[PDB]
Amino acid sequence: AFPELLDRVGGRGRFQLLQAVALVTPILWVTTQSMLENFSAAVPHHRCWVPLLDNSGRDVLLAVSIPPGPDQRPHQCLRFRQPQWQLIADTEPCEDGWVYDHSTFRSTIVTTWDLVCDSQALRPMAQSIFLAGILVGAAVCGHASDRFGRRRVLTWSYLLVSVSGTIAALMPTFPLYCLFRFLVASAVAGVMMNTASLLMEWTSAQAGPLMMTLNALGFSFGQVLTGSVAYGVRSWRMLQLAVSAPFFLFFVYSWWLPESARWLITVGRLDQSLRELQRVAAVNRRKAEADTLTVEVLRSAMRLRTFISMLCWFAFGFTFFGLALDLQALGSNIFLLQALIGIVDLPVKMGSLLLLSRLGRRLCQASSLVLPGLCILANILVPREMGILRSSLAVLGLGSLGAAFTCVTIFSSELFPTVIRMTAVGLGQVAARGGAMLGPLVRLLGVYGSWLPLLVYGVVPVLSGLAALLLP
Numbered sequence: 001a002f003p004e005l006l007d008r009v010g011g012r013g014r015f016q017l018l019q020a021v022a023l024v025t026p027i028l029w030v031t032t033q034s035m036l037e038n039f040s041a042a043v044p045h046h047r048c049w050v051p052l053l054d055n056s057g058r059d060v061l062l063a064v065s066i067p068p069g070p071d072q073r074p075h076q077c078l079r080f081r082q083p084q085w086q087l088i089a090d091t092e093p094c095e096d097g098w099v100y101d102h103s104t105f106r107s108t109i110v111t112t113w114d115l116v117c118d119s120q121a122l123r124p125m126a127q128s129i130f131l132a133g134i135l136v137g138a139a140v141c142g143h144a145s146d147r148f149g150r151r152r153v154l155t156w157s158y159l160l161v162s163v164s165g166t167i168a169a170l171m172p173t174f175p176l177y178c179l180f181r182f183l184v185a186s187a188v189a190g191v192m193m194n195t196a197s198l199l200m201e202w203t204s205a206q207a208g209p210l211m212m213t214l215n216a217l218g219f220s221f222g223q224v225l226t227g228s229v230a231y232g233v234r235s236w237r238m239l240q241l242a243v244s245a246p247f248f249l250f251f252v253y254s255w256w257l258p259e260s261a262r263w264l265i266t267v268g269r270l271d272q273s274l275r276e277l278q279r280v281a282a283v284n285r286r287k288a289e290a291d292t293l294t295v296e297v298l299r300s301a302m303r304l305r306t307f308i309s310m311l312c313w314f315a316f317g318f319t320f321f322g323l324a325l326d327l328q329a330l331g332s333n334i335f336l337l338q339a340l341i342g343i344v345d346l347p348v349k350m351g352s353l354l355l356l357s358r359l360g361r362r363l364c365q366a367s368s369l370v371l372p373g374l375c376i377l378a379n380i381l382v383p384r385e386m387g388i389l390r391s392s393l394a395v396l397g398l399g400s401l402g403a404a405f406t407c408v409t410i411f412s413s414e415l416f417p418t419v420i421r422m423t424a425v426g427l428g429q430v431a432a433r434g435g436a437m438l439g440p441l442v443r444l445l446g447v448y449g450s451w452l453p454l455l456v457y458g459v460v461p462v463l464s465g466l467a468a469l470l471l472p
């Protein structure tokens with residue numbers, strides 16, 4: 001009978017707008033802490049330390065000291081034992097440390113801990129560990145927000161994000177940085193599920209479109225907050241602090257938001273629920289029907305399609321979270337991409353949805369997965385002679401893969417007996433954050449050709465979208 005009390009107490013109005021505003025803002029920084037592994041773990045050009053150069057014809061010394069490399073560059077992993085002055089066979093690996101290029105980044109984690117050359121597989125694992133953390137944090141938090149409430153967990157998760165982000169920026173060794181990022185990811189997943197649920201519960205029956213639109217449209221401007229804070233702070237020890245600092249201020253003000261009124265009824269905390277409903281009504285200024293609440297009323301109140309959705313969610317999660325955490329290979333000028341993956345997400349999603357829904361729901365579902373797969377697949381074909389075309393396709397693709405996140409939820413998830421969609425939307429997400437941990441692991445296949453990662457990242461969504469045409 002809870003919708004009746006909600007209608008008696010409000011619906012739209014004022015409070016349901018300030019709550020949405022105060023809950024949407026953390027989503028931007030939540031995005032910031034997930035795509036931050038693109039400007040923090042950046043790999044600049046690295047060469048081998050030499051006694052002749054870099055103190056104890058500059059080009060002549062560079063040519064005589066380092067053997068030439070395959071890709072029209074000096075070798076990044078080998079050096080001459082002695083100066084081969086015959087150049088107007090016998091080589092050893094770098095043992096005096098590397099020298100890096102300090103022209104766009106001052107200090108990345110790679111520069112600090114030498115994650116190059118033989119120790120290359122370490123870099124694509126710090127993101128898999130992060131996503132695994134997200135999964136294990138979104139699994140536990142489910143059976144946590146039922147014995148602790150729903151508002152307290154959000155505040156403690158804000159505090160945990162703040163503390164873990166601050167601590168992870170002052171570690172002296174790699175494994176501690178891997179572990180504290182794991183904790184950060186778990187807390188971030190908890191924040192994102194609790195915020196979604198809190199936005200869900202307090203709203204009326206019209207929670208379907210508006211709130212789920214606001215959550216996504218929040219992630220988009222998010223990308224543009226990374227782009228920006230980056231252009232500003234370049235180092236890596238001063239970036240994690242500058243990103244995790246706002247969460248403490250968020251926790252400080254999160255102590256006043258009223259707790260969800262539906263959970264309080266089912267556990268027997270009637271008096272606090274009455275107080276929360278009364279304060280919500282007072283905020284909403286609809287203090288006319290609040291008199292009727294005299295406790296007694298609240299006392300009385302107290303298979304093929306599923307598989308197709310699973311594959312669609314899995315394909316969406318795998319390609320995006322494995323080709324968007326490597327934008328240094330999709331082009332150049334990183335502080336422009338990871339900053340245009342957003343202004344090309346909102347017009348594109350709106351226009352594509354509006355145009356393709358009238359054709360049909362299944363046509364819209366199919367057209368949103370084959371298109372970006374083909375777009376990404378075409379990227380390897382075009383040579384590097386024209387940069388603008390080399391970089392244009394990826395933005396539109398990764399942009400349209402974002403369109404699945406919305407299209408496959410507010411237009412999909414009805415492919416079932418149609419009782420309530422909330423028992424299917426959650427089931428889809430387990431595969432997304434359970435295939436992104438199987439994401440950047442594909443980038444570990446840089447050896448044995450460099451085109452295979454892009455080929456896989458393009459073919460998998462293509463096959464998923466094409467098989468989606470086999471619904472009957």
Ligand SMILES: CCc1oc2ccccc2c1C(=O)c1cc(Br)c(O)c(Br)c1
Nearest residue numbers: 031034192219317321402405432433436
């Ligand atoms: C543009 C689409 C999009 O952009 C992001 C940027 C940062 C974090 C999540 C997302 C995101 C998601 O839809 C999403 C949400 C959750 Br929850 C996940 O576990 C995974 Br994987 C992906």
